[PDB]
Amino acid sequence: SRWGGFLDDVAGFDAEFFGISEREATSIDPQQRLLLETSWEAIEHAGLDPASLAGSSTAVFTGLTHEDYLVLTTTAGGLASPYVVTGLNNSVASGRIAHTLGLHGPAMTFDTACSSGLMAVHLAC
Amino acid sequence: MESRVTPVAVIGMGCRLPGGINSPDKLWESLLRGDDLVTEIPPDRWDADDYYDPEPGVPGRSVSRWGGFLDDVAGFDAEFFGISEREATSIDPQQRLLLETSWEAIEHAGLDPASLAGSSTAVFTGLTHEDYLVLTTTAGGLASPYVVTGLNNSVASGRIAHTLGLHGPAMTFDTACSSGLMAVHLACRSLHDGEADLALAGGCAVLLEPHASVAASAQGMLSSTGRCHSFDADADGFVRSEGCAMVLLKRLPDALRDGNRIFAVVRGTATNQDGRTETLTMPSEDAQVAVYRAALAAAGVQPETVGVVEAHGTGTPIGDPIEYRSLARVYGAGTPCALGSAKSNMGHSTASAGTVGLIKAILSLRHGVVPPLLHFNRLPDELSDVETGLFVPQAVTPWPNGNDHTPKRVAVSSFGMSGTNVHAIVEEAPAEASAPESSPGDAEVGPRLFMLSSTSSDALRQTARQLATWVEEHQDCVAASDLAYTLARGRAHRPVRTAVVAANLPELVEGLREVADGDALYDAAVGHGDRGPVWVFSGQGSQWAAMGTQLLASEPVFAATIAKLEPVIAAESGFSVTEAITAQQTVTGIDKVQPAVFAVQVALAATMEQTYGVRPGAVVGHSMGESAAAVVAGALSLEDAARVICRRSKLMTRIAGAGAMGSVELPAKQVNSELMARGIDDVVVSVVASPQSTVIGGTSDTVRDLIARWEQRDVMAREVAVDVASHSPQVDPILDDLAAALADIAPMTPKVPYYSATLFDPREQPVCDGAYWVDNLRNTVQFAAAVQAAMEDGYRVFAELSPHPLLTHAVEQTGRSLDMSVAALAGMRREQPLPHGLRGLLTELHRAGAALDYSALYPAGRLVDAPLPAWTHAR
Numbered sequence A: 001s002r003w004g005g006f007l008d009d010v011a012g013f014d015a016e017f018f019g020i021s022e023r024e025a026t027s028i029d030p031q032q033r034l035l036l037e038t039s040w041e042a043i044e045h046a047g048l049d050p051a052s053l054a055g056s057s058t059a060v061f062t063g064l065t066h067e068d069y070l071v072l073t074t075t076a077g078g079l080a081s082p083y084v085v086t087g088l089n090n091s092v093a094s095g096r097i098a099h100t101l102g103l104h105g106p107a108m109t110f111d112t113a114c115s116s117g118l119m120a121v122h123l124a125c
Numbered sequence B: 001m002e003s004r005v006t007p008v009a010v011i012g013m014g015c016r017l018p019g020g021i022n023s024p025d026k027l028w029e030s031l032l033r034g035d036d037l038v039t040e041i042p043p044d045r046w047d048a049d050d051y052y053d054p055e056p057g058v059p060g061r062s063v064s065r066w067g068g069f070l071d072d073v074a075g076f077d078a079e080f081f082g083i084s085e086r087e088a089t090s091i092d093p094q095q096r097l098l099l100e101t102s103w104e105a106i107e108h109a110g111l112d113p114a115s116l117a118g119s120s121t122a123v124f125t126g127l128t129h130e131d132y133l134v135l136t137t138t139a140g141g142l143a144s145p146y147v148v149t150g151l152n153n154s155v156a157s158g159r160i161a162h163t164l165g166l167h168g169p170a171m172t173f174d175t176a177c178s179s180g181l182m183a184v185h186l187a188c189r190s191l192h193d194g195e196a197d198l199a200l201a202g203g204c205a206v207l208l209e210p211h212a213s214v215a216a217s218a219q220g221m222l223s224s225t226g227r228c229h230s231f232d233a234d235a236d237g238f239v240r241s242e243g244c245a246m247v248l249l250k251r252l253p254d255a256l257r258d259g260n261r262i263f264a265v266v267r268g269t270a271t272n273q274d275g276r277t278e279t280l281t282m283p284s285e286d287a288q289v290a291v292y293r294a295a296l297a298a299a300g301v302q303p304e305t306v307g308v309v310e311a312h313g314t315g316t317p318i319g320d321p322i323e324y325r326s327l328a329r330v331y332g333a334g335t336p337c338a339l340g341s342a343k344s345n346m347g348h349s350t351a352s353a354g355t356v357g358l359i360k361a362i363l364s365l366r367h368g369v370v371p372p373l374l375h376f377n378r379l380p381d382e383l384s385d386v387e388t389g390l391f392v393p394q395a396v397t398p399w400p401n402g403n404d405h406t407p408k409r410v411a412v413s414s415f416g417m418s419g420t421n422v423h424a425i426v427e428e429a430p431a432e433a434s435a436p437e438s439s440p441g442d443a444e445v446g447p448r449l450f451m452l453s454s455t456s457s458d459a460l461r462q463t464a465r466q467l468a469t470w471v472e473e474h475q476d477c478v479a480a481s482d483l484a485y486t487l488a489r490g491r492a493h494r495p496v497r498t499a500v501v502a503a504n505l506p507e508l509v510e511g512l513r514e515v516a517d518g519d520a521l522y523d524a525a526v527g528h529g530d531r532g533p534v535w536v537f538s539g540q541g542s543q544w545a546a547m548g549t550q551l552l553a554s555e556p557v558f559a560a561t562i563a564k565l566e567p568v569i570a571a572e573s574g575f576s577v578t579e580a581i582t583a584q585q586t587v588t589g590i591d592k593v594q595p596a597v598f599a600v601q602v603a604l605a606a607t608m609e610q611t612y613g614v615r616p617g618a619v620v621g622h623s624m625g626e627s628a629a630a631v632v633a634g635a636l637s638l639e640d641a642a643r644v645i646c647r648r649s650k651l652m653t654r655i656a657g658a659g660a661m662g663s664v665e666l667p668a669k670q671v672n673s674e675l676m677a678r679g680i681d682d683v684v685v686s687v688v689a690s691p692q693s694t695v696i697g698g699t700s701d702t703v704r705d706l707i708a709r710w711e712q713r714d715v716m717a718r719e720v721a722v723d724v725a726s727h728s729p730q731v732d733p734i735l736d737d738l739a740a741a742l743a744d745i746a747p748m749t750p751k752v753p754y755y756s757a758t759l760f761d762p763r764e765q766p767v768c769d770g771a772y773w774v775d776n777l778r779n780t781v782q783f784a785a786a787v788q789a790a791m792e793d794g795y796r797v798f799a800e801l802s803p804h805p806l807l808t809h810a811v812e813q814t815g816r817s818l819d820m821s822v823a824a825l826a827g828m829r830r831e832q833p834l835p836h837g838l839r840g841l842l843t844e845l846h847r848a849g850a851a852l853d854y855s856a857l858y859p860a861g862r863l864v865d866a867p868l869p870a871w872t873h874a875r
């Protein structure tokens, strides 16, 4: 294959708005950045102030896979970066969102190949 | 109701942990002994000295050089799970450990893993690190296509489900180092929702590459000492350690209804997130208090009732005081409460921490005692003023606040870097649902058949060795009958298998020790346990002096059947058969021998049917044994068959065959071509045994000259020493009288599928009337056709009922000619004693792989904690 659907920008991420240092922002998984940004966008699309949800029992679930950024950093050999601990571990995918929004409901990330996109909805239900 | 969630009972667990711990009992023993499992990083993993540096925060270097590691992580049995070696190489060792531990846990519950096919059962597991991905990438060898399913995290639960054919939610998730307890909560909810009925929870943590450790050290997360100071004033941080464990869960009412062993019961659990704090890894005391209260409310259990809390206890100087502060808010309310953490003796597992804590709590409940906390001597100064009844047991300490009227209860807790927190409440399992003390009675003093199985011969030897060790350690703490019941019915049977027969535990210990070092080339079972064996009612020729003496002196059913048949023999055949059975000289004479073998074989079949209950998948009869075969086949009555055998024994004696028997190894068609080349039709083929073994009947002179000619033809041909001929135009004078006198029989439809060897098509069920017996004494018998039909029909297991094997090699050749593997056994060997009886022969039936009812041998018995078979561990 030579083709596919690809984002307009992948490395793009508004780390400053969420109070994120450029170092961790450089080392954080772009998938995590996309999830966080689109989650904020969905929250706003609901008409709710994201700041309003702080200190509430709302929960978060997300499906993640294809940790290709691990391959990239391994090839680059920059695994020694301390931000990798929270920049590449799949756990923080939900945890980063929960901490940013200050939510108290359970935060969990999982992987079910190409079925996470709806199994997350089932789990939330 | 009082618990909003349906209470869930743990019915089994499995674990593979550092320091050679591969069983929960081993973990319990290590914990009681106060042993440590943290060691220096093994060199084969990587050079610890290369990456070690005591200076904090040095880039590219770690602060620790220790860790808890397994005996081996590369060990795995691809053959048992049917995995290609090429594929097995690309598999993440985490997946292999998950699969093996899950299989161990299922067997630890006494359930057959194969029995769960298509069952509505779910599985949940947590994966945290992808060290194998790092290794594959740095090796540049991930171009192998088998890496896709071998590295993707979601495959793990899917792989387990596909191996076991489970039909229920399969989950691979992560909650940092709290995945296990999160999986437990998910399984509990799913069972409450009714989506599944059986769920598996757990997580595996594998340490293979150093860069992750270096990154962790860069964050200051690792202890420089090399040991976790959980709650100690010297808290230096956690230590990375290998780990993998699984737990099986079933709904409590269902478990009670099925009477399965209930290790403990979990009343409820809950989960929440800390939320906004200083960083992504700052714990929130209020959040932990909230999750404690929520879990208690879900379980509907008061906190002061719980005695011991399984805290996280990671050893971080920042985290541990916070965790201690939170617990004092809820637990330790005046009533003393003990504190325990599994990390003190094992270290920290980034995925299995919750599961190992849960298992330690389970064992603590099982023994009503708490192990001491390793390396601990005093709390940090920040906790000096905190008021609570909480305490850390410096030694092995009985259950705090012991109360007969209340079940013992344990709280567990796990926390991850992601900030999500899981807490659960574990309650002591109810009293024994079965009869108290398993209703002891007149336990049989006769030797018990202790089954055994494994994946390979050397693995079988190692399994026998460790099992003997364990039995020696508990020769008095357990009972032989319960152990035998557990082995027979509460354990899956691996393809490589054997058995030891013993009456007392020291005897079993000696027998197991014999094979533990004794060499023997064991082979895996050929049968699949789906069909019963096939009896071989072999004919005359293998008799010897006093065959039945041991059987009469040891098998009550055998003696009863012999005494039952004896008067009918003296009536119809005119002489007693017991005297010939006990005769010190080998029985001779077609009148005398013929009923003797019939009685022997029918008595043996009755013994197998009653004292051992093994049903035949099919039945094969040889010569006069064909009537004896029809006896157990359900086609002939016992009296009718006795009349048949006695009357034919009397009648054949009139002329004594009037001929001779010639056996030649030449193929049957080639034999027919050779015979027709000389016009020697006065002889005719009598037995079709194998494509490389035929028997020809005829007059003595022509048989003798034919076998002389074949010897001149450089082909083996023997005139056997039989006194009479069969299936030859020489017994003709008796045929008319035999048909006339024997027409009184009343055959019926066989109860067991039977192969008519005499008939052209053994697959067709014969009428086995007097005409059939005339053919059986005059027409050729196609034993080769019968065995070929049996193999074609899928049957693989065959056992001779003869006093001595006669055609085991022949049927082996038939299978070898067909090229399909088979197992041929002999009921008894020439002058072979057996004080144990046919029980020893029964072991060979199991070793072959035939189906049978084990409850027929083990109607009841309490399951026990006998160890598990080892594994082939090719790296």
Ligand SMILES: *[C@@H](CCCCCCCCCCCCCC)C(=O)NCCNC(=O)CCNC(=O)[C@H](O)C(C)(C)COP(*)(=O)O
Pocket (backbone or CB within 6 Å): A079, A084, A085, A088, A089, B134, B176, B177, B211, B212, B215, B216, B219, B220, B221, B279, B280, B281, B282, B283, B312, B314, B316, B318, B319, B350, B415, B416, B417
């Ligand atoms: C268990 C989690 C610890 C083990 C997880 C290892 C992560 C390695 C990631 C590897 C990815 C890339 C691989 C290939 C390069 C656990 O219990 N977590 C909680 C430990 N306790 C916590 O509550 C806090 C732990 N650390 C701390 O106490 C603080 O976060 C510190 C002070 C270390 C961080 O500094 P600051 O944020 O306060």
